Design an enzyme around this catalytic site. Sequence first.
Site, PDB file in Angstrom:
ATOM      1  N   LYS B  64      11.345  78.664  27.776  1.00  0.00           N
ATOM      2  CA  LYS B  64      11.000  80.104  28.395  1.00  0.00           C
ATOM      3  C   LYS B  64       9.895  80.736  28.031  1.00  0.00           C
ATOM      4  CE  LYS B  64      15.442  80.439  30.114  1.00  0.00           C
ATOM      5  NZ  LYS B  64      16.077  79.152  29.602  1.00  0.00           N
ATOM      6  N   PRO B  69      -1.740  84.217  28.159  1.00  0.00           N
ATOM      7  CA  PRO B  69      -2.445  82.941  28.185  1.00  0.00           C
ATOM      8  C   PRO B  69      -2.674  82.000  26.879  1.00  0.00           C
ATOM      9  CG  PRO B  69      -3.405  84.193  30.024  1.00  0.00           C
ATOM     10  CD  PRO B  69      -2.381  85.252  29.015  1.00  0.00           C
ATOM     11  N   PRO B 172      20.487  75.744  36.215  1.00  0.00           N
ATOM     12  CA  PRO B 172      21.569  76.125  35.283  1.00  0.00           C
ATOM     13  C   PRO B 172      22.375  77.054  35.821  1.00  0.00           C
ATOM     14  CG  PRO B 172      19.602  77.410  34.743  1.00  0.00           C
ATOM     15  CD  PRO B 172      19.218  76.506  36.052  1.00  0.00           C
ATOM     16  N   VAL B 174      25.870  76.283  35.911  1.00  0.00           N
ATOM     17  CA  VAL B 174      27.072  75.417  36.468  1.00  0.00           C
ATOM     18  C   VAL B 174      28.071  75.466  35.344  1.00  0.00           C
ATOM     19  CG1 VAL B 174      27.822  73.152  37.055  1.00  0.00           C
ATOM     20  CG2 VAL B 174      25.539  74.176  37.722  1.00  0.00           C
ATOM     21  N   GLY B 175      29.371  75.541  35.615  1.00  0.00           N
ATOM     22  CA  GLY B 175      30.450  75.429  34.722  1.00  0.00           C
ATOM     23  C   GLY B 175      30.763  77.026  33.876  1.00  0.00           C
ATOM     24  N   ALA B 176      30.208  76.978  32.734  1.00  0.00           N
ATOM     25  CA  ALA B 176      30.693  78.045  32.010  1.00  0.00           C
ATOM     26  C   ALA B 176      30.377  79.560  32.714  1.00  0.00           C
ATOM     27  CB  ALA B 176      30.004  77.982  30.587  1.00  0.00           C
ATOM     28  N   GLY B 179      28.980  78.719  38.165  1.00  0.00           N
ATOM     29  CA  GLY B 179      28.418  77.982  38.881  1.00  0.00           C
ATOM     30  C   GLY B 179      29.180  76.679  39.310  1.00  0.00           C
ATOM     31  N   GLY B 194      25.427  72.863  30.106  1.00  0.00           N
ATOM     32  CA  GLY B 194      25.763  72.860  28.748  1.00  0.00           C
ATOM     33  C   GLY B 194      26.938  72.700  28.220  1.00  0.00           C
TER      34      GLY B 194
HETATM   35  O1  UP6 Z   1      18.990  81.466  34.206  1.00  0.00           O
HETATM   36  C1  UP6 Z   1      19.124  80.638  33.166  1.00  0.00           C
HETATM   37  C2  UP6 Z   1      20.543  80.340  32.726  1.00  0.00           C
HETATM   38  N1  UP6 Z   1      20.580  79.472  31.633  1.00  0.00           N
HETATM   39  N2  UP6 Z   1      19.585  78.782  31.229  1.00  0.00           N
HETATM   40  C3  UP6 Z   1      19.881  77.966  30.226  1.00  0.00           C
HETATM   41  O2  UP6 Z   1      20.470  76.602  30.875  1.00  0.00           O
HETATM   42  C4  UP6 Z   1      21.597  76.356  30.080  1.00  0.00           C
HETATM   43  C5  UP6 Z   1      22.750  76.778  30.498  1.00  0.00           C
HETATM   44  O3  UP6 Z   1      24.045  76.327  29.364  1.00  0.00           O
HETATM   45  P1  UP6 Z   1      25.319  76.482  29.865  1.00  0.00           P
HETATM   46  O4  UP6 Z   1      25.838  75.518  30.806  1.00  0.00           O
HETATM   47  O5  UP6 Z   1      26.281  76.259  28.553  1.00  0.00           O
HETATM   48  O6  UP6 Z   1      25.808  77.804  30.606  1.00  0.00           O
HETATM   49  C6  UP6 Z   1      21.403  77.129  28.549  1.00  0.00           C
HETATM   50  O7  UP6 Z   1      20.476  76.430  27.510  1.00  0.00           O
HETATM   51  C7  UP6 Z   1      20.564  78.412  29.115  1.00  0.00           C
HETATM   52  O8  UP6 Z   1      19.789  78.826  27.894  1.00  0.00           O
HETATM   53  C8  UP6 Z   1      18.355  78.915  31.784  1.00  0.00           C
HETATM   54  O9  UP6 Z   1      17.479  78.182  31.477  1.00  0.00           O
HETATM   55  N3  UP6 Z   1      18.157  79.553  32.843  1.00  0.00           N
END
Ligand code: UP6
Lengths: 219, 218
Positions: B64, B69, B172, B174-176, B179, B194
């Site tokens: 993230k 820069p 990301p 998906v699932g928990a 999504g 995840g």
């Molecule tokens: O907008 C998002 C939401 N989640 N994540 C990352 O994607 C994974 C989502 O994991 P999860 O399937 O356990 O929710 C985690 O590492 C979270 O930090 C992102 O990069 N962006």
Amino acid sequence: VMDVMNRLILAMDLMNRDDALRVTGEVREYIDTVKIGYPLVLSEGMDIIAEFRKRFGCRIIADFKVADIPETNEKICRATFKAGADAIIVHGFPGADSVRACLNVAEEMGREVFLLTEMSHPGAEMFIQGAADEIARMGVDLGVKNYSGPSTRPERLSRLREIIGQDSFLISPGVGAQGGDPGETLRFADAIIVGRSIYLADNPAAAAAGIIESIKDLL
Amino acid sequence: MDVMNRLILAMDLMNRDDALRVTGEVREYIDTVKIGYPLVLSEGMDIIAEFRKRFGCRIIADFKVADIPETNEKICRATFKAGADAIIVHGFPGADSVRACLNVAEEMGREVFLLTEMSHPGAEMFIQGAADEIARMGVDLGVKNYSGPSTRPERLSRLREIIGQDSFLISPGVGAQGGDPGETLRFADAIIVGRSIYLADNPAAAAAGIIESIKDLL
Ligand SMILES: O=c1cnn([C@@H]2O[C@H](COP(=O)(O)O)[C@@H](O)[C@H]2O)c(=O)[nH]1
Ligand SMILES: O=c1cnn([C@@H]2O[C@H](COP(=O)(O)O)[C@@H](O)[C@H]2O)c(=O)[nH]1
């Protein structure tokens, strides 16, 4: 609030343990608070925090610009505090839930969160600047007590100080290399953050001493 | 980038033994692992090389990246030195901060993923309103890899529209986070998963199940 010696925080962004330790040791008489970020941590490990605590009498601020979803933010804060950081810097732009997650861990673990409002680099004008007053107000509503804001934009730093109130603690990077002035910045910030102006100097101690001399009436 | 089964494992366990065991359990289903700060801050950056040694998998460093820069450059350099193939970067800090990352990636033979909109509720406060413009900025900068939210397929579709079909899009949430795998793959090239896998009683069955649900999408 934390008692920052000489209102001066070292941004230790050297990426080598030996150089980072040497420079920090050289300025230790002037600075009791060190900001350690990912350049050093990703190069040397979270144990660098332990090493600094062992070597120096320094408070540690982990500048991790925490900017994930609440669940991931929680994990990052836990790992960071477990390692011995006194405080962590967190972005506000991901929203209130993401910030609250960090605040909750800090409360549970007896540590502190700093909320970054506006960044000091040119690109900050694109999105962050327009959100910064609201991010600051959100911090106040969430009970955030510690903030970071931009030395490079005195007018913005002044407005951000107004929003958070005089009782909040405000630190400010962008002094020196990025163009900010120590004295002018301390009109509004409790402490200034300085990296390259010190750590790239031929004599980091002289550089720190020089900055401190320039603001002596403000100490 | 060619992601096996269109499925990227988000390995956010914070213990080396568990992380390696669970990844091993699902290795037949994936060839791409997203490693973030939960694991890296608990076990060190050496974990990346260890994953490559054990699995030969592709590694996306989900860091993230969100600094100025000069600092972004350092973070990317440290991350690619550790063996990451790609890094996830925020767009909110602006174009110069993104360009800093693109520079190091080019230098070290790696990829930058630009995060446009996040998948959690708080994304609505500031990010969502900037997200289309962040995507256009990516296009302007020559960014080819993007991340967007499984939890808002209408937003993910809009993102896809902006970046075009040639760009690579991972998603990301998906699932928990709520999504759906198949709906997300209408727009994203690959889904990130995840907890639905790594917190499952049986991670291998969890992964197999997800893949079964999208089998017609390959
Ligand atoms: O907008 C998002 C939401 N989640 N994540 C990352 O994607 C994974 C989502 O994991 P999860 O399937 O356990 O929710 C985690 O590492 C979270 O930090 C992102 O990069 N962006
Ligand atoms: O808006 C900003 C600008 N810089 N920094 C951090 O403060 C330090 C500035 O260092 P410098 O004195 O070498 O410019 C670096 O660690 C940089 O990542 C911030 O946290 N916020």
